[PDB]
């Protein structure tokens, strides 16, 4: 069926876990959030 193509597109792939939790990372709540995510990556 690919012998007659009409229109197409190119899409970017999905994320790793790292970048997902990284987005999740982002007053004191800010600091502790940052710390927690850092410790998680560390343990990883």
């Amino acid at each position: 069926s690919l012998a007659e193509v009409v229109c197409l597109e190119m899409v970017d792939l999905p994320l790793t876990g790292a970048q997902a939790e990284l987005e999740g990372e982002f007053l004191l709540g800010m600091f502790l959030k940052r710390l927690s995510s850092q410790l998680i990556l560390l343990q990883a």
Binding site: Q19, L22, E23, E25, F26, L27, M30, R34, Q38
Partner: protein, 97 residues
């Protein structure tokens, strides 16, 4: 020597700030926002690290001294001055012992 530990703590905290800011930058280039500034927390952290580190490095840098010669002559007497080591001679009472 606590000031050494103080300086090492400033350095460690500063490095932590740099890491946090690099990963935040990655977030930025990833969400294609490229509009916002840095969170305050990072800024405060790095600045305090800088100030503390300077206050400690001033102490551990060394110690000043007077530029008046006779200050170091206050405690001195002939006994030191008189010896002249390059003119020593041993034909004296001590050789008895």
């Amino acid at each position: 020597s606590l000031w050494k530990g103080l300086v090492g703590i400033g350095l460690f905290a500063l490095a932590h700030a740099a890491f946090s800011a690099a990963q935040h930058r990655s977030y930025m280039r990833l969400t294609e926002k490229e509009d916002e500034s840095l969170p305050i927390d990072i800024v405060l952290q790095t600045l305090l690290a800088f100030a503390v580190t300077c206050y400690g490095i001033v102490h551990i840098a060394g110690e000043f001294k007077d530029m008046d010669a006779t200050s170091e002559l206050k405690n001195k007497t002939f006994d030191t001055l008189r010896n002249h080591p390059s003119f020593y001679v041993f034909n004296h009472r001590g050789r008895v012992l």
